[PDB]
């Protein structure tokens, strides 16, 4: 059929498999449905509507733009980065196809391409390892853009690359008064404090996300990690299983795909269920019920 042909033609340099069980490309004007679905909450199926609209227009420059960000928000970092790369090779001049291709690139701890992605992002800018040239070009220490969100608020990923969890904390704390409304940006200073111990004082910002976006699934993951680091197993497990439960909403009986992207999540209930000696779930709970 025409839909099947669309699927094999997508199965290309633009592979992005995304098992076809969603009836949203059947719905007309999917772009509007996509923008209206996340206007309140639940970016999960909003990312699905973005997939639906982006599936039949390969040349749509802005289709991949929000799709990459919303697929990075929902913790599925794997297919989102290759989708963003395919977006980048089409129009290789945009901050969105480079900023989200740099910070999310470090979640896999691939320090190689992150530096060149940062270089590409800083390219437009109309006005103990390699580091040196990239960091010097970045700098911009109150040179002519004091309190510049995209630069001053950002670039903490560079600090996170060097595992220097002392300068990043301040570089993010005194970077949120400007543009003081972005739940995703909160995560940027929500985990960098957690990674340097200090679990309690990094907890509040997590609830801060719930102040504006009570639909995030990565904030719940981060707070479960922090609680597990604090060895408070029971409610940590309860809240993380709530996080997986909220990760899939609606089309869930048919909303599954390759079932590898939600692997680490379906691993983190492990490494904890063996600490309170209950077990009894182990490999038996393999059906993701």
């Amino acid at each position: 059929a025409e839909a099947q042909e669309q699927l094999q033609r997508v199965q290309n340099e633009t592979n992005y498999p995304f098992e076809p069980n969603n009836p949203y490309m059947y719905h007309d004007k999917p772009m509007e449905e996509g923008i209206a679905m996340l206007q309140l909450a639940n970016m999960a199926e909003a990312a699905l509507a973005f997939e639906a609209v982006c599936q039949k227009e390969p040349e749509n420059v802005e289709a991949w733009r929000r799709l990459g960000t919303t697929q990075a928000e929902n913790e599925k970092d794997c297919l989102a980065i290759i989708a963003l790369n395919h977006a980048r090779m089409l129009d290789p001049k945009d901050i969105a196809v480079h900023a989200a291709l740099a910070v999310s690139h470090t979640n896999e701890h691939n320090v190689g391409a992150a530096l060149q992605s940062l270089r590409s992002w800083l390219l437009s800018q109309p006005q103990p390892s390699e580091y040196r040239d990239c960091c010097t070009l970045l700098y911009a220490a109150v040179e002519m853009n004091p309190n510049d969100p995209q630069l001053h608020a950002s670039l903490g990923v560079l600090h996170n690359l060097s595992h220097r969890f002392d300068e990043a904390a301040k570089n993010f704390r005194r970077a949120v008064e400007l543009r003081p409304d972005d739940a995703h940006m909160w995560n940027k200073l929500g985990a960098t404090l957690a990674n340097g111990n200090r679990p309690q004082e990094a907890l509040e910002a997590y609830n801060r996300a719930l102040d504006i976006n009570p639909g995030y699934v990565r904030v719940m993951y981060n707070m479960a990690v922090s609680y597990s680091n604090m060895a408070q197993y029971p409610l940590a497990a309860k809240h993380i299983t709530r996080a997986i439960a909220l990760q899939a909403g609606g089309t869930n009986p048919q909303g599954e795909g390759s079932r590898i992207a939600t692997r680490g999540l379906w691993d983190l209930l492990r490494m904890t269920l063996n600490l309170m000696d209950r077990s009894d779930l182990v490999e038996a709970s393999w059906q993701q019920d």
Binding site: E75, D77, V103, T106, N107, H109, N110, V111, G112, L115, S129, E130, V157, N160, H163, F165, D166, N187, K188, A191, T192, A194, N195, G196, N197, R218, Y221, N222, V225, S226, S228, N229, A231, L268, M271, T272, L275
Partner: protein, 323 residues
């Protein structure tokens, strides 16, 4: 007939360990070196010395590290022993948890890359946080599929060296070859058993003075270097001897008795402890009980067991928060 990998050379402990291993290796051996940077430079230096039969191999790597390096997965072909010495230099402001947080991922990746091709091999972790870095390797081996409890060791002989050297000075004319040490490798999880040594003891009120100095010597060394160094020369020698013991046991030329941080399958309730073992042709072949102890050593092992237990729990509950 013996091939040894020194993964993590071209650096601190690694260079001295390789230099010491070049001399004591038996005839017909093969030494392989690896590092992200500097491997060819040291391979072109160790090959200019004499001695027949020893052959040196090396493999460089991409300057920005990448998972599952193609060079390492090809250099790991036909290797019997894997020494893992790859960490971070002791910067002043790193506390005690940042070092573990930065070393756990490196250890996991290196173990995965090495064991993905050659499962039947011994491991000789000498990273630094021995109490916590061994469970990570155990978990990686568990999830991969191949994991032998008899072929996984953690080097902790430096405590024995320190205890012997400190007990040989206050009892001059008398010399003893070795002193047992039980527990872990940290400030509090070390207890030297001084009631199992032949000869008279130098009374109390000084035995306790030596016992705490044994634990504090590491911080003493760190302070002596103006806060910008660590014990590297002494730590290198404590690894070369253990590696030689393992190699000789594997070849069948000896059956040594060593104290190593190894899994205690059964016996003690703590999953991991440093207790005497006897090596052989298949790694550890016979574990040994701790033995009789006095009433003043019973008030330290109880705390050591708890601290080791919580360290193992912390090492096994390692997770990464996504930014």
């Amino acid at each position: 007939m013996v091939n040894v990998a020194v993964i993590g050379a071209a650096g601190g402990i690694g260079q001295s360990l390789s230099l010491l291993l070049l001399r004591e290796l038996p005839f017909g051996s093969t030494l392989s070196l690896y590092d992200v940077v500097g491997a060819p430079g040291v391979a072109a230096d160790l090959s200019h010395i004499d001695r027949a039969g020893i052959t040196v191999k090396h493999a460089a790597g991409k300057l920005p590290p990448v998972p599952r390096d193609p060079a390492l997965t090809e250099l790991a072909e036909g290797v019997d022993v894997f020494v893992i010495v790859a960490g971070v230099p002791r910067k002043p402001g790193m506390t005690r948890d940042d070092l573990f947080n930065v070393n756990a991922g490196i250890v996991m990746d290196l173990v995965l890359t090495c064991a993905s091709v050659s499962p039947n091999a011994c491991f000789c972790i000498v990273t630094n946080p021995v109490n916590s870095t061994t469970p990570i390797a155990a978990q990686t081996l568990r999830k991969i599929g191949v994991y032998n409890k008899n072929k996984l060791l953690g080097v902790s002989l430096l405590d024995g060296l320190r205890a012997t050297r400190f007990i040989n000075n206050a009892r001059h004319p008398l010399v003893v070859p070795y002193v047992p040490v039980v527990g872990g490798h940290s400030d509090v999880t070390i207890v030297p058993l001084y009631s199992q040594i032949p000869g008279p003891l130098p009374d109390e009120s000084t035995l306790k003075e030596i016992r705490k100095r044994v634990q504090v010597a590491g911080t003493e060394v760190v302070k002596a270097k103006a806060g910008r160094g660590s014990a590297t020369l002494s730590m290198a020698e404590a690894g070369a001897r253990f590696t030689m013991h393992v190699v000789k046991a594997l070849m069948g030329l000896d059956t040594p008795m060593v104290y190593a941080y190894v899994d205690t399958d059964g016996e003690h309730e703590c999953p991991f402890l440093a207790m005497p073992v006897v090596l052989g042709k298949n790694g550890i072949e016979r574990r040994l009980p701790i033995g009789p102890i006095t009433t003043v050593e019973k008030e330290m092992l109880e705390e050591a067991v708890g601290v080791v237990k919580k360290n193992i729990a912390k090492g096994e509950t390692f997770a990464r928060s996504k930014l």
